[PDB]
């Protein structure tokens, strides 16, 4: 399962 | 044996040729199990292994939604990276992400990863502590400041110690037929003369899984590292992998050379020679 929350550069 | 799960992001800009392409592939060890491509007719997460097909419809919805949103996020990232390096909107650029977890034989976390690159160069990386970052340059230092404020490392830590290891434990159980099976290499040594006084001995390793393997030639029990030609491990197309090591040998001296093979599918390392 993938990590849900991603963060902007 | 030990195990790993990795997801690989590739976001590629293409000015004049539409919006940037976003691709995601997932792996358990050296086996591909999931795929996403924003250039697909109906972009969604697709199965690539039988043991992932089991997962319910909710699993597939969540996974697709993550990819669709990431497609948007990584397009913003590519725009952001242009300002950070003072680049124009005319060139093509690639952001890559590589993240996941390794587990021990007991299924406990060994270590976690989350690192990015820009145009094939290291950009930012989550350190082994899963709480600090390493930035490659002053551009990524701006990203570091943004992630430290947003408590991002802490979110990775919670995933890597939580969901990453949990799902990998489930995947390893469901796919135990193949994921927890190691196929040993089939090995032999070939003999091709070059000159009248020089011969090529090639040590083959075929049909092995996983990819990790060691092939070394020894001359009188002495390593020939700097004299061995060693090709990159290649996939056969049936899950297994292939590799060969070769040495240029004076004719008559073939029996002084021994091939040595190390692979997890073998209970003991193998020593083989040219069998005339």
């Amino acid at each position: 399962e993938e990590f849900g929350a991603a963060a902007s550069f | 044996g030990s195990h790993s799960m990795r997801y690989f992001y590739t976001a590629m800009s293409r000015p004049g040729r539409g919006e940037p392409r976003f691709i995601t592939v997932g792996y358990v060890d050296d086996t591909l199990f999931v795929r996403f491509d924003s250039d697909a007719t109906s972009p969604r997460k697709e199965p690539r292994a039988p043991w992932i097909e089991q997962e319910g419809p909710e699993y597939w919805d969540r996974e697709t939604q993550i990819s669709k949103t990431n497609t948007q996020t990584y397009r913003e990232n590519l725009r952001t990276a242009l300002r950070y390096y003072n680049q124009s909107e005319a060139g093509s650029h690639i952001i890559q992400r590589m993240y996941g977890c390794d587990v021990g034989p007991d299924g406990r976390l060994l270590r976690g990863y989350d690192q990015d690159a820009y145009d094939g160069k290291d950009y930012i990386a989550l350190n082994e502590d899963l709480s600090s970052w390493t930035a490659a340059d002053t551009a990524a230092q701006i990203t570091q400041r943004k992630w430290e404020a947003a408590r991002v490392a802490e979110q990775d830590r919670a995933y890597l110690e939580g969901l990453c290891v949990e799902s990998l434990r489930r995947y390893l159980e469901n796919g135990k037929e193949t994921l927890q099976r190691a196929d040993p290499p089939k090995t032999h040594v070939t003999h091709h003369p070059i000159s009248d006084h020089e011969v090529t001995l090639r040590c083959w390793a075929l049909g092995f899984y996983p990819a990790e393997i060691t092939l070394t030639w020894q001359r009188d029990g002495e390593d020939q590292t700097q004299d061995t030609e060693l090709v990159e491990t290649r996939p056969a197309g049936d899950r297994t992998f292939q590799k060969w090591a070769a040495v240029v040998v004076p004719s008559g001296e073939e029996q002084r050379y021994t091939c040595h093979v190390q692979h997890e599918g073998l209970p003991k390392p193998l020593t083989l020679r040219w069998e005339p």
Partner: protein, 99 residues
């Protein structure tokens, strides 16, 4: 800035005349990702060649597997034609059943 592709042309199984097999062309170690790969049968392009999904190694360099079903003979020559931004001209690598 840019890295040139490595090329290996090989069969899935040991090559044996008259027996059905899979011809592989494995491109790796290249950056950026855009690449053009043709499998050739006596200088002419094989139709409907399949390829693996884009992936990359620890050093961020990409790798792809191009493949097609084929029945090897003694006379039939096979090759892999590769084009990439690093290459000023398309690179053709002949298939050697002993490599």
């Amino acid at each position: 800035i840019q890295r040139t592709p490595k090329i290996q042309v090989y069969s899935r199984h040991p090559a044996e005349n008259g027996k059905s097999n899979f011809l592989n062309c494995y491109v790796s170690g290249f950056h950026p990702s855009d690449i053009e790969v043709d499998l050739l049968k006596n200088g002419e392009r094989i139709e409907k060649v399949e390829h693996s999904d884009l992936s990359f190694s620890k050093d961020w360099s990409f790798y792809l597997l191009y493949y097609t079903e084929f029945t090897p003979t003694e006379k039939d020559e096979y090759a892999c034609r590769v084009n990439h931004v690093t290459l000023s001209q398309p690179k053709i690598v002949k298939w050697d059943r002993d490599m």
